[PDB]
Design a protein around this nucleic acid. Structure first.
Length: 942
RNA sequence: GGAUGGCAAGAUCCUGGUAUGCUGGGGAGCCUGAAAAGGCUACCUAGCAAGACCCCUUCGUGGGGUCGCAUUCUUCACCCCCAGGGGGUUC
DNA sequence: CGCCAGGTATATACCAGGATCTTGCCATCC
DNA sequence: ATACCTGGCG
């Protein structure tokens, strides 16, 4: 079903956008622009204001959940430890706010005599300390915490500052002492500081260290006379912290054996592998040489490198002191099969760094590790290998033989080489055995152990596998969708050109490799990437002006080039990129910098004249193509019903008596859905929906009003909980929380065909949550939401009377980002500040951004860039008078653009909501992927 | 313009934690009130997405573990990849 | 009320140190 | 930035 055509692909990668183009060629001459679209993605940003990516915000929330859960676990274990001890935690209720501190300071000052009062005061103190234990390095241990200066340097300075500030010195004194004393002397004092950006005085500057809290705990242990047993146990209980780790899923796998994980660099197998590979590439002068090394010489230098305790032996030392060759020039190396030969004689040869680090650690700290020292003496290298890998894999998760503890806690103070290596451990071991037994290069050892071509590079990643970087993946997803659809509609491309704007250098390498795998699979002659501004010179030396290509008005009181203005330029950059070859971009990019840094008109060369004569046609191809409005700006749609279910701040409920008078606002606010349905029945007995207008009473103060429920019957003085605010809300964890942003909106309409009324139902994730519609197999856009859901509670009253009367039916659904093409007739309901905007920017393509209230929808122009308009707005307020009238208009408009009344939007015969293919062509057929439709005339659901 | 050894900085997440914050439950100090009932500034305590599942059972009517704000066309339908994950759908 | 148009609240900020990546620099050998 | 508030003007 694909018609083969000779074409070229062009990609222009931006920070928040990507320009894609498929262009057919004659010979090397462009005849027609098959497709040219500029997709506008978000860069993976989840909170636009923070800048945090969606992925990051998710991970933060995940780790917060697990922090809370582990804290629950250790606190319940602490309660279990100080039950059998005989102590008593702080009860949740009925205590004094200053009992914990009064405890923690008396226990550190005086010896409490009564054993019961001692035990409860201790229970108070340790319970509170575990609940407020301070900070420490997650990688260190409790026995490591015990070995730090106690008290802290920060705490000693804070304490000296407090002693001079409050004119009192406290022995010893602990942070509990100063806290309880300041909560006595100057009440209302805040302990740790905070910033919320006004006027207040705190008691502490820096975060308190767990070492200070442990210091206070041992002060109490000394003063109260506690045995070594229980004091050690309770410190291990209060400062119990899970040790950080990498999950085994995040380590790369070995390309030669994908069943195995990348080894640690500290690995003994790797140290041997590196030395054996370094020597296996050595050659010795025999004339008019050269020769491989004899088995004896190779073993000699391998053992000489393995045994050394420092990295001192150079290659000159190998060539003279070991191989006994006359001069250093008689030894060289060859790195590749059929490649050049060189060797720096001054450089050092590799050595086993981990065995040497263990050697110096044993020689320095031998008293502390007597059995390990003797162990690593006589054990052969196959056992040492497993031990070193166990040390590395427990030092990063991630045992093994006859381990005494006393030595083991010093063995964790050992610094081994960090980082991982390309190949697995068993792979290194096998490659060394073949290189040692057969005296052979690494490239032939590869073939001996595994069946592999000569030579072969480790496999390059494909398009359908991610980069982990959220900014690069938006580009990757759009690109692979476009390229798949282009290979299906037309032929596979002949050339692929990509341009980037180290932040995008990684993006360059990732995109390049994935397109290289694509090319060697589907057969593309040339695939090139370029940095960074090759297209700007290509254009403005071929006289392609983007404000002249698209007839757009001047913007400044100057004659500046407004190229970032129209978001279609990404596409046109793509289309011009398809005309390039590495040499032409070479000679153009040189000239750009040659000019911008240092009569006069430039350049010309045999490739440049050929390029220009072959590409002369584009000047008019672009005019014709932009005239027919063939260039499309698109925004991908977010349909997945995932994200924040509700706003995060819990809010306190209000209450309302059943017998009192009600208004519409107070009835929409009823929390219980059963109580809600009861009052909806009392407001209209045959009604399915709440048809009340807020700000206006609908029920009297019926003194004998009862509402019968299957739970219970309520009396006229009973109280029912109400949400705090007359806005879409839900109940989570005993509080009220506003719904989050709307997932989508459903477009209903009713009335005559020649003049119909429209309305929107603003559907949120809280709506789908309470309706239990997040199960499998649900269509979130057409699945009835009960009348109690916040969506129906806050629909337009016109809508809720029209839907219950059966006249209104769901006709479509809108989701943030999709496109509103008002066709050739354009916005006719223009009024106010919008119309003065349309006199200078005649925009017909609009993008949905939100659903502000129960009667409006938020639209931004699709072709104009928000960031450039912000540039203008910040510019006029700092440098005024430097704008045209259209510049002032564009500056004032864009922060919120069109905040349109839905009534004045959907009343456009034919207006099309456009849903594009990756190639930028509107789907018209009512297929399984989302498709275009017209609100004025579209078959209702079912 | 190649090869090799080393250094530094940056980027993206991942793991474990620290203070705040919010709601519920408390009460040291305090200001308005003849009250009566509510605000203040701190501190103590539980929880922090709604939820979906497993496991071990000594069967405790109680306990241990995972997933839950990413992968921008949900769900339904076709075409693909090396029996679970990842992709594409031309207007 | 229909239709605009201004104004404003949202959870937020640290830590050390792995895994996965990129640039830029230094030096010594062809 | 998004979804709330108030409020003018007819």
């Amino acid at each position: 079903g694909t018609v083969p055509v000779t074409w070229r692909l062009g990609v222009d990668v931006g920070e928040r956008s990507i320009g894609l183009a498929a262009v057919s060629y004659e010979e090397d001459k462009p005849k027609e622009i098959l497709a040219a679209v500029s997709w506008i993605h978000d860069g993976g940003v989840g909170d636009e204001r923070s800048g945090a990516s969606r992925l990051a915000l998710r991970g933060m929330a995940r780790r917060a959940r697990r922090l809370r859960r582990f804290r629950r676990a250790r606190l319940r274990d602490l309660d279990m430890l100080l039950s059998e001890l005989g102590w008593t935690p702080l009860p949740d209720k009925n205590v004094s706010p200053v009992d914990a501190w009064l405890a923690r300071k008396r226990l550190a000052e005086e010896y409490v005599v009564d054993e019961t009062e001692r035990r409860r005061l201790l229970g108070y103190a340790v319970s509170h300390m575990a609940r407020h234990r301070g900070w420490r390095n997650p990688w260190t241990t409790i026995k490591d915490l015990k070995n730090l200066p106690q008290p802290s340097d920060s705490w000693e300075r804070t304490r000296e500052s407090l002693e001079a500030r409050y004119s009192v010195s406290l022995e010893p004194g602990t942070v509990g002492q100063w806290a309880g004393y300041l909560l006595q002397r100057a009440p209302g004092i805040r302990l740790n500081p905070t910033q919320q950006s006004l006027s207040n005085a705190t008691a502490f500057e820096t975060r308190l260290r767990q070492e200070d809290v442990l210091w206070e705990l041992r002060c109490i242990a000394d003063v109260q006379g506690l045995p070594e047993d229980v004091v050690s146990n309770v410190i291990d209980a209060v400062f119990c912290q899970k040790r950080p780790s990498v999950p085994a899923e995040r380590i790369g796998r070995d390309p030669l054996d994908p069943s195995q994980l990348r080894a640690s660099r500290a690995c003994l197998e790797f140290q041997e592998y590196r030395i054996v590979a370094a020597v296996a590439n050595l050659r010795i002068r025999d004339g008019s040489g050269s020769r491989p090394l004899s088995l004896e010489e190779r073993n000699a230098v391998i053992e000489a490198l393995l045994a050394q305790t420092e990295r001192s032996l150079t290659w000159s030392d190998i060539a003279l002191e070991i191989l006994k060759l006359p001069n250093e020039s008689d030894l060289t190396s060859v790195p590749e099969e059929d490649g050049p030969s060189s060797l720096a004689y001054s450089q050092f040869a590799p050595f086993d760094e981990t065995s040497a680090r263990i050697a110096e650690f044993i020689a320095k700290n031998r008293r502390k590790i007597p059995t390990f020292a003797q162990w690593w003496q006589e054990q052969d290298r196959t056992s040492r290998s497993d031990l070193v890998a166990a040390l590395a894999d427990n030092s990063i998760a991630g045992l093994l033989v006859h381990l005494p503890d006393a030595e083991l806690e010093a063995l964790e103070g050992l610094a081994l080489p960090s980082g991982r290596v390309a190949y697995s451990r068993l792979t290194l071991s096998g490659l060394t055995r073949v290189m040692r037994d057969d005296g052979v290069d690494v490239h032939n050892a590869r073939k001996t152990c595994f069946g592999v071509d000569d030579n072969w590079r480790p496999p390059l990643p494909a398009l359908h596998e991610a980069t982990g970087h959220p900014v690069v993946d938006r580009n990757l997803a759009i690109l692979r969708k476009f390229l798949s659809s282009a290979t299906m509609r037309w032929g596979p491309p002949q050339s692929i050109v990509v341009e980037l704007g180290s932040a995008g250098g990684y993006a360059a390498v990732a995109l390049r490799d994935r397109l290289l795998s694509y090319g060697e699979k589907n057969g593309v002659a040339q695939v090139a990437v370029f940095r960074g501004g090759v297209t700007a010179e290509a254009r403005r030396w071929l006289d392609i002006s983007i404000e002249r290509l698209f007839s757009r008005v001047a913007i400044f009181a100057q004659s500046t080039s407004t190229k970032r203005l129209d978001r279609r330029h990404h596409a046109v950059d793509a289309v011009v990129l398809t005309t390039l070859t590495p040499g032409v971009a070479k000679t153009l990019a040189d000239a750009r910098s040659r000019r911008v840094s240092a009569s006069t008109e430039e350049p010309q060369s045999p490739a440049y004249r050929q390029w220009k004569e072959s590409c002369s046609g584009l000047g008019d191809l672009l005019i014709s193509t932009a005239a027919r409005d063939s260039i499309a700006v698109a925004a991908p749609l977010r349909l997945r019903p995932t994200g924040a279910l509700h706003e995060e701040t819990l809010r306190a409920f209000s209450e309302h008596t059943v017998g009192a008078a009600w208004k519409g606002a107070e009835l929409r606010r009823i929390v219980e859905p059963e109580v809600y349905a009861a009052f909806l029945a009392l407001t209209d007995p045959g009604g399915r929906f709440l048809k009340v207008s807020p700000s206006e009473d609908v029920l009297p103060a019926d003194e004998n009003r009862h509402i019968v429920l299957s739970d219970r019957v309520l009396g006229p003085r009973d109280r029912v909980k109400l949400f705090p605010d007359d806005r879409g809300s839900i109940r989570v964890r005993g509080g009220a929380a506003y719904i989050a942003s709307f997932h989508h909106a459903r477009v209903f309409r009713w009335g005559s065909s020649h003049s119909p009324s429209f309305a929107l139902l603003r559907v949120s994730l809280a709506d789908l949550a309470v309706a239990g519609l997040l199960r499998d197999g649900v269509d979130v856009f057409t699945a009835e939401l009960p009348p109690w859901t916040p969506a129906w509670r806050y629909a337009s009253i016109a809508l809720v009377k029209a839907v219950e009367s059966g006249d209104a039916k769901q006709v479509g659904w809108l989701v943030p980002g999709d496109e509103l093409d008002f066709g050739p007739e354009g916005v006719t309901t223009a009024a106010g500040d919008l119309s003065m905007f349309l006199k200078y920017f005649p925009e017909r393509h609009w993008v949905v951004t939100g659903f502000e209230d129960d009667k409006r929808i938020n639209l931004k122009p699709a072709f104009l860039s928000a960031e450039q308009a912000e540039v203008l707005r910040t510019e006029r307020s700092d440098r005024p008078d430097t704008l045209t009238e259209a510049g002032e208009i564009l500056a004032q408009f864009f922060p919120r653009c069109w905040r349109a009344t839905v009534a004045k939007v959907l009343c456009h015969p034919g207006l099309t909501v456009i849903r594009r293919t990756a190639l930028g062509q509107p789907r018209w057929r009512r297929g399984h992927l989302p498709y275009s439709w017209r609100p004025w005339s579209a078959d209702p659901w079912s």
